[PDB]
Amino acid sequence: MRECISIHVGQAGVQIGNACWELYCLEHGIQPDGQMPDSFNTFFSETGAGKHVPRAVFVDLEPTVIDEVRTGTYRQLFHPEQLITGKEDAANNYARGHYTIGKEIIDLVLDRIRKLADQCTGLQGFLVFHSFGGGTGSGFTSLLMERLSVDYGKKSKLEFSIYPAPQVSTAVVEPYNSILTTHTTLEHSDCAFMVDNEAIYDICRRNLDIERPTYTNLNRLISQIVSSITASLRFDGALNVDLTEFQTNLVPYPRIHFPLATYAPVISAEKAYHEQLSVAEITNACFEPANQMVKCDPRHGKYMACCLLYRGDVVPKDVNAAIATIKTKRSIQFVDWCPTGFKVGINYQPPTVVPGGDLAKVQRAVCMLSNTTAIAEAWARLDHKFDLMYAKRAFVHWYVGEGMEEGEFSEAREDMAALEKDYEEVGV
Amino acid sequence: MREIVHIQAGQCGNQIGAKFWEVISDEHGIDPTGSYHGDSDLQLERINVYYNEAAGNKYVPRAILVDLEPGTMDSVRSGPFGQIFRPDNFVFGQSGAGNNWAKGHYTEGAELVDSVLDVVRKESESCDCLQGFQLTHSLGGGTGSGMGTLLISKIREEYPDRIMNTFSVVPSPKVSDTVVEPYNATLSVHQLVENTDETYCIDNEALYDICFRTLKLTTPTYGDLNHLVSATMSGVTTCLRFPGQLNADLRKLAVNMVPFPRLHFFMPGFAPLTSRGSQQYRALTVPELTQQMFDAKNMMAACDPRHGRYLTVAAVFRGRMSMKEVDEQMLNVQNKNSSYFVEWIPNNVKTAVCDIPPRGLKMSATFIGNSTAIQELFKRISEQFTAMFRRKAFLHWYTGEGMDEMEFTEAESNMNDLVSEYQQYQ
Amino acid sequence: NIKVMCRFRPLNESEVNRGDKYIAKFQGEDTVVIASKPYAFDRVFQSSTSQEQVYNDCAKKIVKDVLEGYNGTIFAYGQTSSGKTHTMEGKLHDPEGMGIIPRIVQDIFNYIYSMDENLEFHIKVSYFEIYLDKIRDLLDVSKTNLSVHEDKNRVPYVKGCTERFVCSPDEVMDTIDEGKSNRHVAVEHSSRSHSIFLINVKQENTQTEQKLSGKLYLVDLAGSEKVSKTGAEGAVLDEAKNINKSLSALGNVISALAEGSTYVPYRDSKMTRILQDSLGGNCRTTIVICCSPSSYNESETKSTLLFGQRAK
């Protein structure tokens, strides 16, 4: 069988998971109580009385957001032992989430994951949702990833992260946590997807015509992307591509594994009409520099490989025509050592609409994941911020009072520099 | 779960605390008798932060009231909400401090601090997970300054891994009621700068200015001042007892706001503030709250932020609002006023959003700031201290209790070093 | 001015059987290359270096200066099994194996035995430790929470510390042994608290009626610990946190002094407050960092070299 285990660590991860699991329940016809009045085994397991329990683990060092989950409208969906909470949070500190407060609920989450993995035959991989720049999402994720790599090893790990934006920011100590966690995510992850909130704000404003968005809209978009990724495992169609095929067609060298995601069409109900919304029109919109979910224009870079995923009413002839038209253009550059740079997948299941949402009922959609050399701009900005703050050694006393030496900062900065010089040298 | 123990010292602290407890009880729907008459579950969801349960659905605050005279005690006990406090938590003596720092720190406060520590230790061992301590006092008096300083030292020695935040009323330049205020203020800062995690600076002059100008009040009394202070105290820790889109705790605010250990002196603020008869003409939106918060004439400390640069700013929001608007406002505030922010720290602002507004409002916000303009307060206190200390005036009231001139010189040097620390980043 | 020296040690027989490899490559006389990364110091010794050369290039000028009424400070940083004790104690009686402290006392008393008869000398010795941010006296265990105060000339000092008179090198060695008997040591012989030694040499000329006072500080620092790779729980973790914070504060003070900063944060730790008079101004301070060339100890050597480089 084909099954996935999802981990939602931190506030951002828990909220994204709320969106994701509402979406999956609506997709598979499962009521919030686990009763539906075989396409769900990837994300649900039967209990013998008709109830379905998600293969999810929710983690946080603070008892607040998980408590909202525990008394909300999905309180009878989750196993009470899957939602794990602590006493005091990491307080925007990597070290607190890594060791001092991390080494208290780590064994519990490990035991829960081991229990979940034993109840599934064909494990396919892990789906980890967290946030760079926080305490728990950066520190507890490093420890969790280290142990899982030690324990399971051969299974794939896919990470969905929130990266700091170039201008908009929430915390003051975000660069430190981001640098340390991006040093941790190189060795243990197998494929990393980064999305920043500023790009999604821009997408919401321009396309959906909402002037005052909140976190819920962002989480709905991210859930749509993840569902498009897992549709091939869940449902059936022509040219279905699973996790290992994505990895073997998207990662040229072992360290170059940081793709950029995009979705199309993000249209409103009013503008849903008055538009053809064909295969070619959807495909062309996935290469525009304003529809990217990271603040980086791919025109300042070269593509290496891209995997295109179609769900709905799509025919392969149209995909071939769209690929040919994209290949004709000049503003889109491909590296000279990848003459064939596309992986095509089609699924017959159209996207599902959620009540009380902004997206319109479309008949087809795409989700392009591409790894370019243009992903090194955001890293450069974050490194500049980090070095500016670290020259004066501000806020470093908070990190060393929790058992962290002062050489970790230099080591992580060196690792980031090495990674950037790789993405530059492989580009040429 | 993240409980806070509250201590009130002196007349000013006790009165501010009484107003604070009335406000908090109103927010949580608690009757004066200790009963619950609310209308929502979120009121009772996190009541353990500030209240202790009792038999038959009764709630007693986790407050400890300490003084050297019984007059404030029996003024508080007979008020509207005097029946809510535990009678065993009133600790008082009979001979007052007499506006003497030395007396309350060495002679009379030493014979009363064992009882206060006993009640604190009993109260703190009944907590499932302690988060920190709160102290309300005044630096310019005798019992507040000396006794609160001694209590802070003892508590920090006992619990060294906990938050200690204080709301200290600081002597004002143009408004004064004591002749020996500079001595007490200096000797109190000399200890606050070492045994505290984050101290909020308040002065009566700024509160009077707010009341006279913004609120258009005719005859303000201490009730209004204590009410403003209680509003900011409630706003600081709103994320410890209600849900929200972004959560910030006390340790989070300390981590983001304190770059170096000494620099932990803040100037609070609140929004909205309008006058009756002028609320119908004003629209309440996030831009209005942001505009009022960063105004120089809204801070509760008698310092002008334009005479200095912000090191960090913390903004805590209450209500239903968009995150895009908050981020945009907090970015354009820095972009438009780049000359008032430190250059080597990007993103000087931290944002927290809670989803339950104060009763009777749609939106609200509290402002915590860390600016180099706080150095002028210490400069005025030091000027007055040196003027009075050259002649050794009023100094035999202190050396008669067991003090020394070397203590005065050490406190002066510590204040000067703090001023030199802040002046570097200007 | 601040001088930073780095001394290495030869690989011992107990680790020559494990096939451990030398990692250090020496360029000239002021650099060491580890993992293809240069590390520049004022002078870098090698394994063939002798004790006398270390004394002549590290502590002779300070000893001569203190005798002229000035002040000086000598630090000593290293991980366990890195040569710290050999470089700053060595064989207590071997003329070719003695370290820095016995040589200093030898020179200081050879000066007295050769300076006329109109000069009177008195030597004061203090010895205390800093454990969990608390000053403790190693010559009298009764005192455990001493405090730091100031005199009229804002020169900080420790109030209540035991200060005893000595008249021969044997007495100084005896008091050093007595002090080391009560230092907090982990279960091979790892130190968990900083140790400070004060030798006060005051001379008064009877004829000219001129008085000179000099204080010499010898600090034995504890090493930083990476907690995530050790598994610290309980008191060990608290000690590790305190040590890391104190070492970072000392680095901040030294960097501020070297970069010519207007403000030097002497008040961010107990230790830097004590040494306010003997660190800045016209005082000579040297830092001796000891490392090992084994491949098994690459990370600790890197940490020590980085701490030494922080001084600059």
Ligand SMILES: CC(=O)O[C@H]1C(=O)[C@@]2(C)[C@H]([C@H](OC(=O)c3ccccc3)[C@]3(O)C[C@H](OC(=O)[C@H](O)[C@@H](NC(=O)c4ccccc4)c4ccccc4)C(C)=C1C3(C)C)[C@]1(OC(C)=O)CO[C@@H]1C[C@@H]2O
């Ligand atoms: C019709 C209407 O909207 O009336 C408002 C009002 O007019 C204004 C002017 C209120 C009013 O406040 C004052 O006049 C005031 C008096 C003394 C000290 C400080 C303020 C108000 O009294 C105060 C009151 O505030 C609250 O209800 C908050 O929950 C507040 N409550 C208390 O302070 C409180 C008072 C008595 C008993 C128990 C609690 C609060 C604020 C922060 C944290 C917790 C609670 C409000 C909105 C109003 C009135 C009634 C006129 C203002 O104050 C507050 C704290 O909201 C003054 O500027 C604001 C703006 C408001 O619009």
Ligand SMILES: Nc1nc2c(ncn2[C@@H]2O[C@H](COP(=O)(O)OP(=O)(O)OP(=O)(O)O)[C@@H](O)[C@H]2O)c(=O)[nH]1
């Ligand atoms: N998309 C999305 N991003 C969020 C959300 N909440 C916080 N973030 C982002 O996450 C970062 C802050 O990290 P958090 O996840 O809130 O912190 P944490 O992981 O809970 O760690 P601690 O609270 O410090 O213990 C900021 O960049 C926020 O913009 C959310 O609900 N949705």
Ligand SMILES: Nc1nc2c(ncn2[C@@H]2O[C@H](COP(=O)(O)OP(=O)(O)O)[C@@H](O)[C@H]2O)c(=O)[nH]1
């Ligand atoms: N806000 C407020 N300030 C007060 C109150 N009473 C006194 N103060 C201020 O506190 C300072 C005097 O200290 P006080 O507390 O009266 O002396 P103590 O009783 O010995 O601690 C002066 O600056 C007063 O303006 C009060 O009820 N409310």
Ligand SMILES: Nc1ncnc2c1ncn2[C@@H]1O[C@H](COP(=O)(O)OP(=O)(O)O)[C@@H](O)[C@H]1O
């Ligand atoms: N530079 C050196 N040359 C020769 N031997 C050395 C040197 N440094 C250390 N040793 C040997 O190491 C042994 C123990 O070292 P020690 O002083 O205990 O280090 P630490 O105190 O850091 O554990 C000594 O017996 C000494 O012979």
Ligand SMILES: [Mg+2]
């Ligand atoms: Mg959180």
